Amino acid sequence: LTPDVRNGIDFKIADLSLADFGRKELRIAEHEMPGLMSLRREYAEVQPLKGARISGSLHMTVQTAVLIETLTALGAEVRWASCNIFSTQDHAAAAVVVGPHGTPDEPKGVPVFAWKGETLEEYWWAAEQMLTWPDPDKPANMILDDGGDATMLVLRGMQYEKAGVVPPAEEDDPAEWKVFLNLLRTRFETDKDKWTKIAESVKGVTEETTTGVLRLYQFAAAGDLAFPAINVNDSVTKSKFDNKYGTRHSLIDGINRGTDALIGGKKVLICGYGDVGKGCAEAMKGQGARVSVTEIDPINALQAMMEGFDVVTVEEAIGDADIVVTATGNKDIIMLEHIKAMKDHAILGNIGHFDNEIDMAGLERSGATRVNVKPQVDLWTFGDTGRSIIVLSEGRLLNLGNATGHPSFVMSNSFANQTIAQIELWTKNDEYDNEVYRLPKHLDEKVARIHVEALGGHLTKLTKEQAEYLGVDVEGPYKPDHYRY
Amino acid sequence: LTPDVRNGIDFKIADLSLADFGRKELRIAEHEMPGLMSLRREYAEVQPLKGARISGSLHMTVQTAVLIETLTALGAEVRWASCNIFSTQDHAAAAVVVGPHGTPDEPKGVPVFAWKGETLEEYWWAAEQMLTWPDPDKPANMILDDGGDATMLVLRGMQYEKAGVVPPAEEDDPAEWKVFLNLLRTRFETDKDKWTKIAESVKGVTEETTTGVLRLYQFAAAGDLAFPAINVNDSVTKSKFDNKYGTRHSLIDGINRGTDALIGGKKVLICGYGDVGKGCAEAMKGQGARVSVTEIDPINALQAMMEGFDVVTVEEAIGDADIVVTATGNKDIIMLEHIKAMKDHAILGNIGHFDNEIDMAGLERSGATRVNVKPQVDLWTFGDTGRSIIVLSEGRLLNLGNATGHPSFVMSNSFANQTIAQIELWTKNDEYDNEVYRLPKHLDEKVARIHVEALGGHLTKLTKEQAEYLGVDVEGPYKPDHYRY
Amino acid sequence: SLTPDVRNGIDFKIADLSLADFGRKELRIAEHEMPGLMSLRREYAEVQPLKGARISGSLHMTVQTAVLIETLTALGAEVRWASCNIFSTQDHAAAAVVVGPHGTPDEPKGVPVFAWKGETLEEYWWAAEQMLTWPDPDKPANMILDDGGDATMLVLRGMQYEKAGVVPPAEEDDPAEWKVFLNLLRTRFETDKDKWTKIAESVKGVTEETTTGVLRLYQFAAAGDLAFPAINVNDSVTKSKFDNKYGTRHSLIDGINRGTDALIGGKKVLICGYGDVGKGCAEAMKGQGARVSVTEIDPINALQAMMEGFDVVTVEEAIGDADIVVTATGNKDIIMLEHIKAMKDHAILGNIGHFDNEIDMAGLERSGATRVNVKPQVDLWTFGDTGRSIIVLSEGRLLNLGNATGHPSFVMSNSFANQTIAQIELWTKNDEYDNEVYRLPKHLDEKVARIHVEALGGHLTKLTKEQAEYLGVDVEGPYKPDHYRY
Amino acid sequence: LTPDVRNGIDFKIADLSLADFGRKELRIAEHEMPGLMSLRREYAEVQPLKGARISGSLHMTVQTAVLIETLTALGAEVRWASCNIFSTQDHAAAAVVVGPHGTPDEPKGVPVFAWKGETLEEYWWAAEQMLTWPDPDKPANMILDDGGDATMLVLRGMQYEKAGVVPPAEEDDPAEWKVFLNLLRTRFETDKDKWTKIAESVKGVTEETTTGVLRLYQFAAAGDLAFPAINVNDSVTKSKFDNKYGTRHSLIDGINRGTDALIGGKKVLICGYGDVGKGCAEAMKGQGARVSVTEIDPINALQAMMEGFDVVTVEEAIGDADIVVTATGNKDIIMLEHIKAMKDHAILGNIGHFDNEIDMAGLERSGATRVNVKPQVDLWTFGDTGRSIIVLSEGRLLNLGNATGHPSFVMSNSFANQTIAQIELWTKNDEYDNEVYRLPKHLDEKVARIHVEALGGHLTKLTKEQAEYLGVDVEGPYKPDHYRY
Numbered sequence A, B, D: 001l002t003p004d005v006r007n008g009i010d011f012k013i014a015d016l017s018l019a020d021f022g023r024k025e026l027r028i029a030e031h032e033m034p035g036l037m038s039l040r041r042e043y044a045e046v047q048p049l050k051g052a053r054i055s056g057s058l059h060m061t062v063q064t065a066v067l068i069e070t071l072t073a074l075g076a077e078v079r080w081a082s083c084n085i086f087s088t089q090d091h092a093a094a095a096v097v098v099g100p101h102g103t104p105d106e107p108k109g110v111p112v113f114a115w116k117g118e119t120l121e122e123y124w125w126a127a128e129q130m131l132t133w134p135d136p137d138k139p140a141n142m143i144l145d146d147g148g149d150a151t152m153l154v155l156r157g158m159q160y161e162k163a164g165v166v167p168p169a170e171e172d173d174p175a176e177w178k179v180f181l182n183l184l185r186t187r188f189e190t191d192k193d194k195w196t197k198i199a200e201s202v203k204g205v206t207e208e209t210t211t212g213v214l215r216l217y218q219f220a221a222a223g224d225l226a227f228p229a230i231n232v233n234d235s236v237t238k239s240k241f242d243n244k245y246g247t248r249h250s251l252i253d254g255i256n257r258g259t260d261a262l263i264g265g266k267k268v269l270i271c272g273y274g275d276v277g278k279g280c281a282e283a284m285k286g287q288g289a290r291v292s293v294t295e296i297d298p299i300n301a302l303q304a305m306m307e308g309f310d311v312v313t314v315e316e317a318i319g320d321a322d323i324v325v326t327a328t329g330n331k332d333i334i335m336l337e338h339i340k341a342m343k344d345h346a347i348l349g350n351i352g353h354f355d356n357e358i359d360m361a362g363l364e365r366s367g368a369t370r371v372n373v374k375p376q377v378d379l380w381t382f383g384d385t386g387r388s389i390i391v392l393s394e395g396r397l398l399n400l401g402n403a404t405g406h407p408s409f410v411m412s413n414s415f416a417n418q419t420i421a422q423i424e425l426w427t428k429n430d431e432y433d434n435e436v437y438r439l440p441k442h443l444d445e446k447v448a449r450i451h452v453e454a455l456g457g458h459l460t461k462l463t464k465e466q467a468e469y470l471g472v473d474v475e476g477p478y479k480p481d482h483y484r485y
Numbered sequence C: 001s002l003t004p005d006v007r008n009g010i011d012f013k014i015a016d017l018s019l020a021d022f023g024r025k026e027l028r029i030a031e032h033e034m035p036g037l038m039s040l041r042r043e044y045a046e047v048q049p050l051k052g053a054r055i056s057g058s059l060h061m062t063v064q065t066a067v068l069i070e071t072l073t074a075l076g077a078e079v080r081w082a083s084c085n086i087f088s089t090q091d092h093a094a095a096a097v098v099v100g101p102h103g104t105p106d107e108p109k110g111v112p113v114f115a116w117k118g119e120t121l122e123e124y125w126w127a128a129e130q131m132l133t134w135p136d137p138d139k140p141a142n143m144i145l146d147d148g149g150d151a152t153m154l155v156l157r158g159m160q161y162e163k164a165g166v167v168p169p170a171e172e173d174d175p176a177e178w179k180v181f182l183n184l185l186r187t188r189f190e191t192d193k194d195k196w197t198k199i200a201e202s203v204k205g206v207t208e209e210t211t212t213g214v215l216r217l218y219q220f221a222a223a224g225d226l227a228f229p230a231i232n233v234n235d236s237v238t239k240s241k242f243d244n245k246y247g248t249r250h251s252l253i254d255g256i257n258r259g260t261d262a263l264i265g266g267k268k269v270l271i272c273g274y275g276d277v278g279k280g281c282a283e284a285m286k287g288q289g290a291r292v293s294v295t296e297i298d299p300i301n302a303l304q305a306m307m308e309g310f311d312v313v314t315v316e317e318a319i320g321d322a323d324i325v326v327t328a329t330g331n332k333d334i335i336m337l338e339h340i341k342a343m344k345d346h347a348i349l350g351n352i353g354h355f356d357n358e359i360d361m362a363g364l365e366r367s368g369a370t371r372v373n374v375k376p377q378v379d380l381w382t383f384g385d386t387g388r389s390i391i392v393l394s395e396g397r398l399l400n401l402g403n404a405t406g407h408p409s410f411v412m413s414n415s416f417a418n419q420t421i422a423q424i425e426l427w428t429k430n431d432e433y434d435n436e437v438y439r440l441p442k443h444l445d446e447k448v449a450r451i452h453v454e455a456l457g458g459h460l461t462k463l464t465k466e467q468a469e470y471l472g473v474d475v476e477g478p479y480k481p482d483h484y485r486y
């Protein structure tokens, strides 16, 4: 694996001739992304990001394209990789590399290292390409991360440099841990302070997802978070909309492309009843399913029951579930003993961030046979029972891998939050300690207001007398810091 | 255009080498179509359809492939074509020509003339193939229709022969009407009684949708119904299930693939509140759209309202609609006036059985400029306003054009009913006069019973005093003839 | 001895006539919510289509019924009225009907009414005979307006025993209402001999409002026993697809909220039956956050319950887990004593069918379980052997009208428009009807539906000349074939 | 007005003979209130509240009665008054004064000063009764508040005492403001530090509603909150269940009792989209209504739109609404002006905490005539238009004025949180300063867990390795502090 170069842009993607079809959907997506457009207009002259060099780990989709060309429209230089092996949309990747005014032959866009259907080896390769800038004296000075793989690579790789050695891996280290480490080990043979120099260059990380943000909270508590981080996941306009309303749209997209299995009349098991779970269950309900949920949190559980859902354990429900979805951000939800209890031709998929919510490592060692139906749809048969399980996306996130992820309108919230967070960490950089921060409420409202307008919502303006009575400014913020919406 | 023959089988399709992919999904499909699988088992011995030569005009999909292969398992010969130029699933076309035990080099299935993306001319050519059996002495003897296109062809065809002329088409007749006429006319040159003979030979037609059944009721009212017809659309297990629940599923699949636009938050306009309209609104609603309905029938109108929908006219509503779907079975729902009024990048599609629900002819002659984004998605632009519209499937049923149609489990009801009507008309032709029939309630109940059973429902059994209180047999039909479900 | 009251020439038996002014206020509000009936008063005001009609009505004595009663009188008809349930009467509504739009309690101008909330079985049948029995033996009732067939049954059985020349004895183990019904007939026979025979001869037609009563008319007609014409009012599309469904969706949870104040959200709800009423039931409970399961004997209804997100289960497997149990079948013997004894502590048990035989009320009353009345129509039963108590609504009689008010005015507007349309048809075109069971014609259902679309603010599209041609329909309707199921 | 006494207990209630009906519904409520019931068992022997003298201002309902008897079962002494003029359940007041073991003759319960249909004069007299403990050396040491009127009475009272003047009222002050001061000024003529000594005696207040809480925030802000407060409202188990799921149940109850107008098919207008408004909107949706929402907060607005609801202004939507419901906790939502614009027989009510969301004061001055239909249902007519409006509960909260408020199972959450806040503020009292606190997550989850098992919900237990993965204890808390559920 070696990068390609064309008119001064280095990259690796499926197919550069997909740019026209890429660019077509870019423009449509832009009508569906008023958050990002409004920010381009608000920030064109200002150039808030001049001097920013952004390293991005984020699903290389159409919506991430519009995100990228917003970031560059505010002065940033970017380099990009997907944060999932299947989530790349090749046509969006190509329009990124070509740019709005370039061609396949003479691309005038940004470096992108991503294509749909990476191996774990090429993924980690593309991840290192995105963090590695041409001139050794101006490395990445900023990170846009989703999952924390960009962040994790930087900080473990500094830890290994500062310790002196990149460690061995045993056996029951995941196949990815090997690959991950393999990358850093070889890197060390030739380069003794690569990551350390990146880590002091980087002003901040902004992190998109619940999981990445969890990893962030564990670096801060170790003492190992080297630069500030905005938790973008926990914008109100991120979680309460993307995680939930995004998934309500995209779960069922993922399952329809995978399987064309009817949803109505079916027993559907959702594991997890957070924002993602709530989105899944709502979607399944709307479609006529008989939805049951799992949960470890008594509160989240009380909500599911108040929404008409049984609250049940995997063990109790698994043998009779027609569709099983894991949505927990946790590992070990569907183990092999579960998969063997499942019914013939039941569907099994994961919509959390990682491929370990489902025992894929166990299923591959089990003596089941895999028959590939088509991209990202696999049919697994146990010979002892005769029963087959349809597995979506090798247990990686079915929505981004079997479909196209959330809709443009949803990501317009998420990526508008992401843009803002980068501006703030870049322009107001000494205003931050080495901690996880969340955006101010005024800015959450800013973003919400763009989409209410875009949708045709008519807001009531508080009178002077009304805002004295509520103790708030007419123009926001409207709620206490602990308001949960 | 001429047939391909390979191993004694004529056919014309996209690509024969897709038979294994088709086969895999067909086999998956059999696990989701207990209705068809169960009639295969019941009637394997009997071979109820021996001597049948069935010409089938029905969307060449995986679910049809399973119907087709149900009929051949019961001893019928078939010749097949799609009832729509975009509806064919080519991997399934391949699967049926190859057969369950053939390969592409040695195919062992049946004649299929169908591919996704036919032209009108090719559509009519394909259809003639399907109705024209190899042996002049052994013409088609059954028609299995969906939309009445095969029925119309035999009957206008015969009509023109008894007339000794095929009418010249008027200079402003629709493109398809000219094609249709030109096909018949070209044939009257070399074969003067082809269609009359076929019509003498055909013992029955089974009709699967509302539009087509209308046309039967029109041939009958004219005295021009030359054979018995079973109205399969209006089996309870068909209309109340396929038309409603099918659409609830396949509509948003159609939209997610064609456009990937967020439904939640959007103003959705659904023209028509028949079963298909009911299904669309249910679908949109569950997904968070703000749904308004149009209707001409105050009964269906009041139902919408009672379901939480504004009942509005296209004129008052079109300006505001983010997504516009026609679901009427009628022509001229959305004229060029209406399209020129839609907001920028609004979406327009038709899920009714033909493409005159939208004014595609007016849109094609308008002067607007077309840009194909990808198959079955076109962005139309008007110079005088600068507004562009996303048109799905060129006004053709969008669930099948832009997606896969209804799921297997749904189609199992419809096709079990079609299978049953085929058997009835074939084995008992004498019991039927030249009229349009519906199947007895007890058969509808049979099909229902199989699917409840498949999903895990537990039916209650009437005691003897109960059954006598209700005036019904414990097993027997359970509801009066006028019962509306 | 129960005897009627007479004030100002108007005989009646009701709770309290001082309730008229209240009743009247609510009736007036109710007219705003019943455009169906209101438009019918307007359209038929000078044609007086019901002059000479003497209508005996057996239908819940509610605010909505009162508006129907006065629609019929606005149109020339005379009436005598009883409720078709011992708990369904709204006493202030009863009051206002006897008083009239312009009467007072001391100077009543209304019509005869025999109904109060909390009747006994014997009072119910007495009230029923009072309603059926017009003042002049030479001017008997000539029309029946029925809900559940009790009037029609009283007459048709009443005549069939006369002829038989005697009224049977009842068995040790006959239902208590049967012994009562029989004792009424047998007692009148000792004095009168052709009372019901002459009445059944006088009646020009019956209009039946509900599913249960229509089964009974099908069962009279099949036996050669239907002796005047019938219109099945239930199977108007505007009736069944609207009242039975959307109506029950309103009034089911009303009944439960009044009866119990139990949170519906998070609870397991067993709905027996998935006809239009079961569908209304499950809809209503689903939207309140309930965990809904359904029982059914019919695979079509059952396949719909499943496609709507509901398990289809037997009472046997379901009963131990359900927090609220609602019967909605039209059938007998749905929740037996073994079933009730299996219910969890303080689960709620309700019937929303037309008769109380859906729940084993006789069985439970002879079980040995102790009864404590909580309040009007909420009773708490205790089994000594398990220590479990169950909350029984309306002593097993329809719970929406027993524990609440029934369906809203807007919903009844549709049903009552249809019945009013039927009465007029059967009265003025009596000639063309045979002694069969009839349904209204589509254009009339459409008429009803249109008033209500109009009232609600909805805009109907009008077919062009080409669309109507293309569909083979007149522009002005009817819009659908005869078998169309909506 | 002077209180009654009987067997040592002073009270002013409607009718003591209602105690039997009172007590039967109490025992049924207890089966619907596992939170309260688990706290009676947990804390029976520990007697945590001994020495607590709790002044209760909260809706005198069946549910509040099971709360009270939990408090007394835990050692507290209490005096009670309702916090709304119509919300008292006369028979719950009775069973409370009688106790489980007394008779109407010899009551063995607690002091209550509450009945349905108090005048403003009577409401305030009763609040003072409730706060004025019989021994001067043992005044109130605890307040349990809903709406902040008890808190207001105590801290304004004291403030006027420290200033030597209860300030003369202005000729057209809100009628309620005049009654407030008349009560103070009159006590002040004879008692110059009644409230000062009461404020110095109260160790803390536990506040139950969003609106009470607001006021608490405006005491702290001014430096005037002279004891610790607990925000009970903002336990997850309170706001996300009571405000939301409570209202979903009770809104429609109050409407059905008051009016028995069909909800399906009607245009409903919900002002405000917080927890209450989401509750209302949810409820009206399920019943079939064509619901529109008003809002000032774009985040809340974007939720309503994602949820199938137009966001609109009163002005735009008022002439067309069938049912208008304000859920804002703000003032001046519906003015006389909007009221005059309402359609004939439109229904109008308020479900926020005070009456002034609707311009009641201006309605009464308008020249509209009031006809009382029955308790809490009034018909108002404008002679100049001839149109009438049904106003519910004189614009006081309609669920508790026209019905019975939230059901037992919902209030089991609120009142378990309340009982816990009372234990904590009382037993661990020194650990608290004169600020507004919120209970710790682990306590919320504790309350949630009781109700989930009561409902038959089966929680999943995290493995050691699962807990370690998430960095949480197997027994919780499971979420960070900013988690919004």
Ligand SMILES: NC(=O)c1ccc[n+]([C@@H]2O[C@H](COP(=O)([O-])OP(=O)(O)OC[C@H]3O[C@@H](n4cnc5c(N)ncnc54)[C@H](O)[C@@H]3O)[C@@H](O)[C@H]2O)c1
Residues within 6 Å of the ligand: B209, B210, B211, B212, B239, B242, B243, B246, B247, B250, B271, B272, B273, B274, B275, B276, B277, B294, B295, B296, B297, B300, B327, B328, B329, B330, B333, B351, B352, B353, B354, B397, B398, B399, B400, B405, B406, C461, C463, C467, C479
């Ligand atoms: N695409 C699919 O997967 C699928 C499935 C089933 C049926 N269909 C096709 O769907 C169409 C509708 O079928 P259906 O079973 O719902 O029919 P339907 O007869 O049940 O309802 C169509 C409704 O549209 C209303 N309508 C007619 N003209 C109108 C106008 N100008 N404006 C607004 N409303 C109008 C009618 O009153 C009618 O109720 C038919 O062509 C049918 O063949 C498609």
Ligand SMILES: NC(=O)c1ccc[n+]([C@@H]2O[C@H](COP(=O)([O-])OP(=O)(O)OC[C@H]3O[C@@H](n4cnc5c(N)ncnc54)[C@H](O)[C@@H]3O)[C@@H](O)[C@H]2O)c1
Residues within 6 Å of the ligand: B460, B462, B466, B478, C210, C211, C212, C213, C240, C243, C244, C247, C248, C272, C273, C274, C275, C276, C277, C278, C295, C296, C297, C298, C301, C328, C329, C330, C331, C334, C352, C353, C354, C355, C398, C399, C400, C401, C406, C407
């Ligand atoms: N309370 C009301 O306001 C109200 C309103 C309308 C009708 N009703 C009454 O409700 C009843 C139902 O009316 P409907 O129109 O829904 O009837 P329906 O005939 O449309 O449905 C009743 C259902 O009960 C099912 N059933 C029969 N026996 C069964 C059993 N043992 N277990 C489970 N299901 C069984 C049948 O399959 C049927 O579909 C009738 O008695 C009618 O008079 C009451």
